[PDB]
Every structure is written in C-alpha cells, then in structure tokens.
Amino acid sequence: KNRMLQEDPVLFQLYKDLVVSQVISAEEFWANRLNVNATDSSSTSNHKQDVGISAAFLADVRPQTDGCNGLRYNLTSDIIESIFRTY
Amino acid sequence: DELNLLVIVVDANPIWWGKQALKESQFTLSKCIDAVMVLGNSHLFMNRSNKLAVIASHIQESRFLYPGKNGRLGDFFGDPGNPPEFNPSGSKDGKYELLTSANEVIVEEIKDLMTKSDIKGQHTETLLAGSLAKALCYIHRMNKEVKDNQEMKSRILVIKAAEDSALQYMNFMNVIFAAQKQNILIDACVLDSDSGLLQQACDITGGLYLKVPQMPSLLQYLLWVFLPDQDQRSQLILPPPVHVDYRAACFCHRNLIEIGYVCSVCLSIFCNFSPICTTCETAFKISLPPVLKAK
Amino acid sequence: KRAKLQESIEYEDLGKNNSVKTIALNLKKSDRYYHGPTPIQSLQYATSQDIINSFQSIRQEMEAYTPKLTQVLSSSAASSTITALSPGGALMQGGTQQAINQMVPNDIQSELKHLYVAVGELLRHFWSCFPVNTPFLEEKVVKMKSNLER
Amino acid sequence: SRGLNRVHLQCRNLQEFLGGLSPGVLDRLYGHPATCLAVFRELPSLAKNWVMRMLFLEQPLPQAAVALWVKKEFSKAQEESTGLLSGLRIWHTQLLPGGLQGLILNPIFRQNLRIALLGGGKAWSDDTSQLGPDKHARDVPSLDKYAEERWEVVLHFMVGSPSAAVSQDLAQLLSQAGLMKSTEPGEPPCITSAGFQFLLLDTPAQLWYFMLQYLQTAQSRGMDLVEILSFLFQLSFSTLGKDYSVEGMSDSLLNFLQHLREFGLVFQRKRKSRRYYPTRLAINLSSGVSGAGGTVHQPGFIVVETNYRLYAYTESELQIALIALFSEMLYRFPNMVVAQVTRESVQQAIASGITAQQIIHFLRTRAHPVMLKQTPVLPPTITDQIRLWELERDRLRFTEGVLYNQFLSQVDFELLLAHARELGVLVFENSAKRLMVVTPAGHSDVKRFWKRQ
Amino acid sequence: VNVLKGVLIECDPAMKQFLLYLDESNALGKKFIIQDIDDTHVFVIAELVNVLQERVGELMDQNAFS
Amino acid sequence: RWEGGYERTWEILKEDESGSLKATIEDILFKAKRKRVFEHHGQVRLGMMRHLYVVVDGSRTMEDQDLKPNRLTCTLKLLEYFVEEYFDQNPISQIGIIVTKSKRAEKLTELSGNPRKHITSLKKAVDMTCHGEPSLYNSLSIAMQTLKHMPGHTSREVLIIFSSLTTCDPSNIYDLIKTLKAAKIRVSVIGLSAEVRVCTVLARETGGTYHVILDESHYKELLTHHVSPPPASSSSECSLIRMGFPQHTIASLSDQDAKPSFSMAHLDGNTEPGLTLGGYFCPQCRAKYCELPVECKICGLTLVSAPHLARSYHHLFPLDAFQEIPLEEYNGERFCYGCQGELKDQHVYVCAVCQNVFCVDCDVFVHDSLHCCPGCIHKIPAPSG
Ligand SMILES: [Zn+2]
Ligand SMILES: [Zn+2]
Ligand SMILES: [Zn+2]
Ligand SMILES: [Zn+2]
C-alpha cells in the first residue's frame, strides 16, 4: 500500500492532506478509497507478458534466447526469466 | 464565392389567420406574406446566385410555394442553369421581374390553399414537422445539383404565427437532430404564442428564436434579424440573448422533475407514480423499479 | 415479440399522453379549449368565411402594395433594438480577484474537496440502499458515522 | 511603372465615374433601370443591410445607432463599409433632426428603388415599350454562336485576322483606346500594349468601359441613356420584340445599337430593325466577377502536372490564338499540347506585365470543367513558379522625383521634412545624408516655400 | 539646393550595385547614375529607362549564359 | 508459354463489342459490379445504453500493407469516424478503449463518452509500434473486472479489433466461455483478412457476431453493422433509475456577477481541472461544472439530457420500409413526392402505407438521414387516435 502512495505523487498529494489537515486515517484511507482497483490497478504486475505463460512467449523463447556473449538482463523478464517460469 | 440558398417556412394557419381577421386587425395575412415575399426577394437582392425555398403549412398538406409545381413552373423550373428554352417568363428579369416571376406563383397557390376550407380531419393544425423535410430532401437534390466549387449555403427560416399542433413529439424532435447533422442554420420568428419545444429546436441549431413585439411591427426586426449568411450575424453584433429554457418532465402522471427513471428498455421515462409497466405488458424485472419506490 | 409489444403500448401512451411535459401540455390544451365553438363550428364558419374573405385580398396586392409604410412602427421597432443595443450597469470587471481566489483554493482545496467525493459518493451509496435494510453492515452503518466528523 | 488600373476597376466604375461627376449628373443615374446597378456593383454585405432598413425608414435614424450597430468585432470593416456607401453620395447626413446628426438616404433613389422592390407598373415595368415575345422566329443557341463569333472577330482582329473585321469605326476608337493603334500609312490595326492585356482578360466590362468612354470622345448624347441601356441590356435574353426597341427608341438608343451588333451583343436584321435581341452575355457584365455561368465553352479538365502545360481538347482557333500569344515553339498536333517554357511564356508577359491572377483566371479558364473533380490546390508550387517568374523580370519600379541634397542645415531639413510630410509630396527621405525623395509635381510648392522662408 | 530631375528606381541591392556596372558599361558616360542613396534607391537621367525596361534583362541573361 | 499466357488474361478483357460502341459494355459491367448489401434490418428486443470495449490487436500483422500503408491506418482512421458516428447515433453509451500490445492489455481510454478524449487518444495511437503478440486474456481480464463493477442493468458488449493472428495467451480462455457466459458480457470480434476458429468458436459461444475484413468499404460496413445497438441475449434488465435531469445555469439569474468564476475548489461541481463560470447543474450533488450529458463522480448518477440521448434511439427502432417498382404510374406530374424531380432509373419508390413516390436521393435521405417517411405525416397525424 505504501509503494502505491509513493510512486504516485498526485494521489500522494491527495494522501497528504488527510494527514496534513488530519482529515482521515490510513486505515480509513484504504477502507473506502480503493476497494475495486485492488483487481484493476493491481492487474499490471501480475500479468507481465501474460502470466501462467503457456502459449504466448513459447513462440519466442527459442529465437530470443541469445543475442551475444552477454546480451542478457534486459528488464525483469528480458530474455531469461520465463524460461525459468515453465520448467 | 458560394451560392447562398435560403429556406423559408411560413406559418399559414387559416384558423388563426381567420382569427387574425376576427380582431379586424391592422395587419392581415395579405399584409403578412407580401413582406415575406419581398423578404424572399431581399435574399435575392444580395447576389444573382441566391436561391429561395418557401412553403406554408396548409391543414391538409404543404405544397411547394416557391418555386412552383404548376404548368407555369412545371415546365419552366427557373432560368439560370439547365434552361427550358422558354421565351416569355425566360425573358424579363433583373431585380423586379424575378419577383413577379415568383409573386404570381405564391398567390395562385395560396389561392389553391385558401380554397380548401373544407377541413373535416379533426382540426389538423400546423404540420410543421413533415413540412420541414420537404425542403431538406429538395436541397439534398440541390446539393446534388452542383457542388463543384459550389458550397451550398442553405439557410432555413421558420415563421410561426399560431400555436403548434398535436404532432408526434419524436417526429418533432428528430429532424432537428437530423438538421443537427445537416449543418444548416434554422431561425424562428413567432407571432402569437411561445413554443418552448420549437425554441429548444433553436437551441439545437444555435439559430434564432423570436417573439414578435407586434404583428404589424414585423418589418424591421424581420429586416435586420431574419436576414442571412451566418456572416451577418456572427459579425453583426446584435443577438437576442435570451433563451431561458427549463425542460425535462415525465410521462406517467405529469411533473417537472430533476430525477427520471426508465420503465423498460424501450426508453420510457415516466413519473414516479407507476407500479406496473404502461410501456408494455412485459413485466418489470423485480430488482430495480421498486427501488424507485424504495428511497 | 419483445419490442413489438413495447411499440403497441408506449406509442399508445404517447398517443393518450402526447408530451405531458413543462410547456408541452399546459399551453397545448388551453388554447385548444380557446378554440371554443369549433364543434359548433361557428368560429370555423367565420374562419372559413375569413378563408373566403382574404382569399381575394392577398392576390390583388394593392392592399399588399402599401403594407410597408408605417414609420410609426419603425421607431418602436428601432427602440427595443437600441434598448437591447446597450445593456448597462452589470459589473463589467467581474473577475480580477479570481486569480488570488484561484491559487489559494486550487492549492489544497481542489484535492481536499476530492477527498470528500471519493468518500461522499459512497456516503450517498450506502444510504442509496439503507431503508431496504439489506446492505446494513456494521462496516457501513458506522462508516456513515466515521467520515461524517472526519 | 506600368498601368494596372485598366484591368479591373469594378466598384470605381460606379464610384470614380460617379464621384468624378456632379450629384445632379448622378441624379440622372437614378433612372429606375439604374436601380439594380447600384446594389450589385458594390459587394459589401454590411452596407448591403444598411440599405434594407430604408424602405421601411423614411425617418433619418440617428448616426450613433448604426455607428454602434456592430460592436468591437470588425469596427474597421464597419468603417470600411461606411464611407464608401457615403461616397456613393446616396446618403444625406442630416444636421440636427432631433439634436444630433442622423443620417438618411437620398429619397429620390428610395423612390426609384422601391418601385424596383414592390409594385409599380411604371415605364421600365410596363405601359410604354419594354419587351415582347410574339412568335419564335429565331433561337438563342444559334445566336449564342453570334455571341461567340463576334468575340472572335473582336479578339482575333485585335491580334490580326487573315479574315477581316466588319466595317466599324470602333477600331478608330480602339486605336484611340491605346489597346490598338495604327501608324499613318494604311492604318494597320495592331495592338499597342493594352489590348494584349485585354487579350489576357476575358470579360465584357472593358468593352463596357470604352463604351462608357464612347461618348467621351467629343460626343454629346445620353450618357444617362446608355448606362440605363447598359442595364437595359442586362435582361438575360429571350426577347425579340415587335420592334419594341423602336417603340422605346431614342436617338443614341438606335444609332449606338447599330454598334451593339458591331459589338455583337444585339442582333439586328434587315434595315437594322424590326426587333431587338439581348444576348446571354447580359449577365457577366452585371458582375464582372468570375462566375460559374461564365464558362463560355466547356472543353474539359486541364492540369499543369510537372509544369508542362499538360492538356488537350482541340478547341476553336481563338483559344489556339489565346495560346498563340502564350505557347508556340514545340506545338503539337490535334489536342493542343504546346509544351512549356519558363522563359518564353515568361517573355510573353513582357508586353503585358504581370498576368498574375490572369494566369490563375485562365488557369480556371483554359479547359473549363477542371474544378469538377480536381484538387483545390491546382498549382501546387506552380503558382509560385509563375510568381517568381513574374517576380523575376520586374527588376524596376519607374518613379520620377526631385531630390534635395547638400542641404545647408540639418534641423531645417527636418522642417522641410515636416513641410513635405504636411504636403505629402515626399516619397522617401535619407536623414543620414540629408536627402528627400520628393514628387516633382509637388516640387513647386516647396520651391515656392523655400524661396519665401 | 540642387534640383534633381532624375528617376528613382527601387530594387534589390543585388541589382542596385549592378547598375553601376551598367553605368561603366554605358555606351556614353554616366547618365544612369546621378546619385544613389544607400542600397535600394538610385537616380537616372530619364532617356532610355523605357529601353532599360528590356535592355537590362536582355543583358543579364546573356552574360550568365557564358 | 507464359509470355502469351500473361496476355491471354489481358486480350479478351480488352476486347468487346467491336465495330462501333467499343469500351462501352465494360463500363456497364462496372455499374453491374455495384449495388451491394443494403440493410436487412427489422429487429426488436434489445439494444440500449451499450458499454463498448475497444480491444486492439497490436501485432506484427500491422506491418503488412494489404489496404493501407499500415493496417492500423486502415483501422485507426475510421475508428474516429466510428467514434463520431456512434456518438451521433448512440450517446446513451460509453466505450472502453483498451489496447493489447506486447502480450498484455492497456486500457488506454477509460469507459467514457467524451469524444475528444477518445479521438486524441487515437491521434496518440498513430505512432504505435504494435510490438509483440496479441493477448486477449489480459484484455478480457480488464473487460471482466471493469464491467464486473458495472450494474446488471447495463448493456455488456465488447468490440475487438483483432489482426487474425495467433491468440497468444494462456490461462484457459476456453474456460473464459463459462466465465463470461455467466457474466452476461457479449464479445464481438471481426477478423482482419483471415479467421481464428477459436475466436470464431468464442463468438459463436458468445452471441457476439464475428466477421472477417474483406475490404476498406467492407470494413466500414461491419462498423456500420455494429453502430446499431444490437438485440443481445434475453434477460439482461428492464429499467435503469435515477436519471438525473439537470439544469443549465446562466450565472446571471438573480445576483449579477457575484462570482468571478464558478470553479474555486469549494463549489458543488467544478469537477475537471479548468476554470468555469457556471453553465450546468445536476440534481443530486447539485453539481455545477462544464456541461456534460453523461454522468458524474459525486452524485454518481446519470446526467441525462433528454433532447439528445433520450431522442436518439427514440426514433431509431420504429422504422418501416418502402417498395420499388419500375412501372409508370406518373404520380405528380412525373414528379417526386419529396424532392420533385425525375430521372426514371426504374426505381419508383413507393411507401408501404401512405404510398408516396420517391427517388434514390429521397430514399437514401430517408434511409440514412431522415429515417422515416414524412408522407406518413399528413397521413398518420390527421386521423391519429
Ligand atoms: Zn419501458
Ligand atoms: Zn449527488
Ligand atoms: Zn425522391
Ligand atoms: Zn409516408
């Protein structure tokens, strides 16, 4: 919940004045604000190149398995991780 | 640029124009249309390219008054463009014989309109709505007449003189929303009563609505205002600014309401006093329509 | 037969109640009642007589030659033109404190108010079902009480 | 430099003429036929509504009401629409009708205009001799050929015909016009410089101008009459007349008519009489503006793709003549596709000067239904080519003047600056070298002023 | 001080310097120059200016040709 | 062999009726090539207040040209037209622009009805690489979870722009049938120049209608086919309640210019980040902000504005048809009941009830712009009862 309020400064600016002007609590902040986007806004980090990866990446795992002696470690899945995510 | 077409819809309620004579007015129907005629000619006086469209609303019909149907223009159909090789009416012109080319054809046809006092169709009053599209098809053909470096600036005049009739409310509203597609200005001068519905039609257009100050005093505002181009009004800084318009009631009992609710999928928004569907015999799904009756 | 059945009854209701809205009904029948001896047709007789009367009056256009020269009715027609040509005394400079009265409320209070509307919409929502006494949860009936003072 | 007013002059025709003459002489220009002439050769939309009240305004409305008819939006356009309408001398500024100047029109025109608005069976409307279709003895598209070929025998004999023109004294006016001229032996009907410009023009209003200048060569007949008759031509066509132009005759009305079949726009039979004929020509004079109806013949589409003139349509010889002045030197056969030159057609404007719009006009007049399915931008870059070609050869701006150098002072030079700027006889100054470009016509007033001090 | 009945021509400085060369390549002495102001404004003895309407463009085209 | 055989194709098609009148009937067959499918409508039941979901395949299939320089160029340009003609016909609805790119799904524009926001999004969607493979499972995931929180009194339809490629997504999207069949959400795809059987089985298991793109004209047809709110499956809803009738406000009613601007972070309304002077007013929040005939965020009800949206479909159902005759009953003086002309290309268009004579340019003007015969007016309303 805390990475949500730090990576987004606009909602943090919203979240400031409930602590600054002491409007509500954090317990009340996550009780009536979010409640729907727990499935919607959290649908980014779970999917990530279609999780439960069966037939999406498997087409491209063999052609993108090698660029060079060190062509690896792109981002998160880059070119090594979903190999581990099947076996 | 362009050709600058005009459209004019005149109210001719012979019930009311008879009632215009019942007060023994200092402004009659004879005094009415002649102004409107030269008003139509005033359009023509800005440019040779200018063209007109004039129809009234008879109780049984709306015949094209301008330009003509009868054997004086059924074989003539105007001189400029696609000529009939017709000599006499094709001869005399230039700001004064064009009008008597069209003066005749209105007074002969309102004669054909004012010979049909034999109404038995249960006060079939002002039939504006179907009369509107009679222009709109014709100018669509006139759009297809020539467009090649020829922008059709059409402009619609509506003239009201009497009350509206009991016509179909949908078929009232739709053509304006179709005129909303059509991108043509519609302007309205009324004489006797106000039409909240037709001034909403003005609001759809962003045209102009006018209550007359006085029926014999309908020659100077008609000069200034109901006068063309959207150039003369987007530049002429004089707009009737008033357009007070509250609306939005419902249909079961009678109201004036800020909260509606539909009765079925059929777009039937009714008053709250409504147990069972009067839009159909299909019953309402029992989760929602008593929540209109719950809080 | 699903929207066939709607059409048979709603246009029937659009027939028996054709536009019972604001101006749409009340001016309508009132002037139809003003037509009066129209089944008696004595007004319609005079109408059809006046249909027959000014029948000839339009076409001659000698009466409708000079249905123009009334400069008596030009001045008044020039008048409400000139009257509406100059409205006056209505605070021409209406703003010019609005920049101070923007940046001070649109620094916190745009977002502060938004703190309410993220909540107050739900505050409308639990009461939008509460007399049915179904969505009656302790999580909600004191959430009525919670943010109320907050 | 070169004259450039002899081409268009389409509002000043009814202003610079009319304001160049007396109010009583333009009082004659309020013949009832001359009423339509006023409204249309002016084209403001803004003055075109300031008229519309006056049929209902007998009263002089106050000036401020229409001076403030239109607010902040386009006050200049209101002002530009105002004094020109006043410059027609059709208005009268009243003194203090109610306490302040409240303007009003000339009523005698309002008399004349309202008959052309509603009612009136008057002398131009009816009752004396106006018009008459009795039984069809002759047809218009046949006479449209006359309305084409007289233009040819006008316009070809300008360039020079292997055929011959008809026996006219008009050439001795067109040689007088400076369009044409002729040296003394044999009198060759050549072109001086200006018919060449009118060869590049295509409307009858120049003919009309020399026909307005027809009485100017020491002739004393109805200039009032002919310009009424100039309108009285502008009645479309479709009228033979039971010699109705002799029932409505006058002296110059019949004689100069002999010239209107020389000008071709009338068609006269045996004894130059028994009928009259207006040609379909009688509506493009009325504007002078381009007009979709002004298509003459409908050849086809053109283009100038790859600026290589790119077109065909074997047309009549006058268009061939219209490009015989404009494209020879790799002409080809049966389609009229003379190639392009960026020098020769450029040299073919040197005897005209710039034909800038007259290109663009004859762009939309080469093959006439080109704007039917083509681009709005018909020359993509090719206008600017024509422009830069026209902006190439124009290396000179001819201007005489008197220059004041080595002045004895420096601040009294600024006096003579302010003296000449008062006079408006300066064209340019150099203060850094104490120089002033002064007109030599307004030289004498400073020459008088300097000798006085 | 000095009555100057010359003719002002205005053009680009590209051609304004060129007329000096036409003055130096005049068949006679200096007439086309009387005094030129700075960059855009010159004065000519008005004799062949009408010829110089075409005597210049016939010359510059030929000189660049070879 | 083939140098002749390349020109055995040309030679006959060049050739026609010779002697006189050559290259003539070749033009006649081109007119005979025309006149494709007209309407074939006449439906009832459902279609009201759709909640559409634009789903875009962003893939390497776009790099093929096939109609345009890009298949998105075929796609994206006419979507704006499809947006505008939708908001023309159906303002009672709203559309979820969701973009699949690189095996995920980005809900690009939210489920809303603000056209400029949707169109500039498409204008933002111009320079899309469309890198990676399509994943519908991520698209249906957004489609579920969003429409899950929509009422069951909502029309639940999904419009998928798929580039006919391999449906590259795991997690038993075949089992998403019973997911969404139960969830009463309709899903309609049209294939770009090919077919996906699984997606074809998907739509036929849906009730959503599947098609294949033939041509750019044909691309427009099915858009136009899906402009109309379709009769989806039975037992969706009946009603939808607390349709807020608003007020326009002039901000000059009693107190003239007592407020320099009607958006100062405290006023009831003032929803969007911009200054305003008071134009509008909702019943339940009493929300005054920039005018919008849709809905709000604090009252949370539907900002219905009846002459616009309670009028649009309000005559889009009750249509009838005409007939065509080549005969000559010369009604009028060889005229039209509408535009009053004649060409006689043997399509004398007669109404079914009032039986009035029209042309193509009067039939089209009804059947595309007027949507009813006004000859029924003067004929319906005079004996109406
Ligand atoms: Zn219903
Ligand atoms: Zn509310
Ligand atoms: Zn038709
Ligand atoms: Zn009908």
From Swiss-Prot, chain C:
Compartment(s): Nucleus
Signal peptide, first to last residue: none
Residues found modified as Phosphoserine: S8
PTM description: (Microbial infection) Upon Rift valley fever virus infection, interacts with NSs leading to ubiquitination by the NSs-FBXO3 E3 ligase and proteasome-dependent degradation.
Family membership: Belongs to the TFB1 family.
Role of this protein: Component of the general transcription and DNA repair factor IIH (TFIIH) core complex, which is involved in general and transcription-coupled nucleotide excision repair (NER) of damaged DNA and, when complexed to CAK, in RNA transcription by RNA polymerase II. In NER, TFIIH acts by opening DNA around the lesion to allow the excision of the damaged oligonucleotide and its replacement by a new DNA fragment. In transcription, TFIIH has an essential role in transcription initiation.
Complex and partners: Component of the 7-subunit TFIIH core complex composed of XPB/ERCC3, XPD/ERCC2, GTF2H1, GTF2H2, GTF2H3, GTF2H4 and GTF2H5, which is active in NER. The core complex associates with the 3-subunit CDK-activating kinase (CAK) module composed of CCNH/cyclin H, CDK7 and MNAT1 to form the 10-subunit holoenzyme (holo-TFIIH) active in transcription. Interacts with PUF60. (Microbial infection) Interacts with Rift valley fever virus NSs (via OmegaXaV motif); the interaction leads to TFIIH complex proteasomal degradation.
Species of the source: Homo sapiens
Gene it is expressed from: GTF2H1
From Swiss-Prot, chain D:
Record localization: Nucleus
GO molecular function, one term: RNA polymerase II general transcription initiation factor activity
Alphabetical GO biological process terms: DNA repair; nucleotide-excision repair; transcription by RNA polymerase II
Keywords for the protein's UniProt record, in alphabetical order: DNA damage, DNA repair, Nucleus, Transcription, Transcription regulation
Keyword Nucleus: yes
Top-level taxonomic group: Eukaryota
DNA damage among keywords: yes
Cellular component terms (Gene Ontology): core TFIIH complex portion of holo TFIIH complex; nuclear speck; nucleoplasm; nucleus; transcription factor TFIID complex; transcription factor TFIIH core complex; transcription factor TFIIH holo complex
Record's comment describing the protein's domains: The C-terminus (residues 305-462) stimulates the ATPase activity of XPB/ERCC3.
Complex and partners: Component of the 7-subunit TFIIH core complex composed of XPB/ERCC3, XPD/ERCC2, GTF2H1, GTF2H2, GTF2H3, GTF2H4 and GTF2H5, which is active in NER. The core complex associates with the 3-subunit CDK-activating kinase (CAK) module composed of CCNH/cyclin H, CDK7 and MNAT1 to form the 10-subunit holoenzyme (holo-TFIIH) active in transcription.
Family classification: Belongs to the TFB2 family.
Protein name listed in UniProt: General transcription factor IIH subunit 4
Organism from which the protein derives: Homo sapiens
Lineage, highest ranks first: Eukaryota, Metazoa, Chordata, Craniata, Vertebrata
Swiss-Prot record, chain E:
Record key words, sorted: Cytoplasm, Disease variant, DNA damage, DNA repair, Ichthyosis, Nucleus, Phosphoprotein, Transcription, Transcription regulation
One annotated Gene Ontology cellular component of this protein: transcription factor TFIIH holo complex
Top-level taxon: Eukaryota
Keyword Transcription among record annotations: yes
Gene Ontology BP term (one): nucleotide-excision repair, preincision complex assembly
UniProt xrefs under Gene3D superfamilies: TFB5-like
Alphabetized InterPro entries for the sequence: TFB5-like_sf (IPR035935), TFIIH_TTDA/Tfb5 (IPR009400)
Keyword DNA repair: yes
UniProt-annotated location(s): Nucleus; Cytoplasm
Purpose of the protein: Component of the general transcription and DNA repair factor IIH (TFIIH) core complex, which is involved in general and transcription-coupled nucleotide excision repair (NER) of damaged DNA and, when complexed to CAK, in RNA transcription by RNA polymerase II. In NER, TFIIH acts by opening DNA around the lesion to allow the excision of the damaged oligonucleotide and its replacement by a new DNA fragment. In transcription, TFIIH has an essential role in transcription initiation.
Family: Belongs to the TFB5 family.
Subunit: Component of the 7-subunit TFIIH core complex composed of XPB/ERCC3, XPD/ERCC2, GTF2H1, GTF2H2, GTF2H3, GTF2H4 and GTF2H5, which is active in NER. The core complex associates with the 3-subunit CDK-activating kinase (CAK) module composed of CCNH/cyclin H, CDK7 and MNAT1 to form the 10-subunit holoenzyme (holo-TFIIH) active in transcription.
Name this polypeptide is given: General transcription factor IIH subunit 5
Organism: Homo sapiens
Gene: GTF2H5
From Swiss-Prot, chain F:
Localization in the cell: Nucleus
Segments forming C4-type zinc fingers: 282-299
Keywords: DNA damage, DNA repair, Host-virus interaction, Metal-binding, Nucleus, Phosphoprotein, Transcription, Transcription regulation, Zinc, Zinc-finger
Tissue specificity annotation: Widely expressed, with higher expression in skeletal muscle.
Keyword Thylakoid included in the entry's annotation: no
Membrane spanning stretches: none
Keyword Transferase applies: no
Cellular component terms (Gene Ontology): core TFIIH complex portion of holo TFIIH complex; nuclear speck; nucleoplasm; nucleus; transcription factor TFIID complex; transcription factor TFIIH core complex; transcription factor TFIIH holo complex
Effect of H367A: No effect on the transcriptional activity of the reconstituted TFIIH complex
Effect of C351A: No effect on the transcriptional activity of the reconstituted TFIIH complex
GO molecular function: RNA polymerase II general transcription initiation factor activity; zinc ion binding
GO BP annotation list: G protein-coupled receptor internalization; nucleotide-excision repair; regulation of transcription by RNA polymerase II; response to UV; transcription by RNA polymerase II; transcription initiation at RNA polymerase II promoter
Effect the entry attributes to changing C336A: No effect on the transcriptional activity of the reconstituted TFIIH complex
PTM sites of type Phosphotyrosine: Y86
Annotated ranges, domain VWFA: 51-227
PANTHER family referenced in this protein's UniProt entry, alphabetically: GENERAL TRANSCRIPTION FACTOR IIH SUBUNIT 2, GENERAL TRANSCRIPTION FACTOR IIH SUBUNIT 2-RELATED
Record protein name field: General transcription factor IIH subunit 2
Organism: Homo sapiens
Native organism taxonomy: Eukaryota, Metazoa, Chordata, Craniata, Vertebrata
Gene that this polypeptide is encoded by: GTF2H2
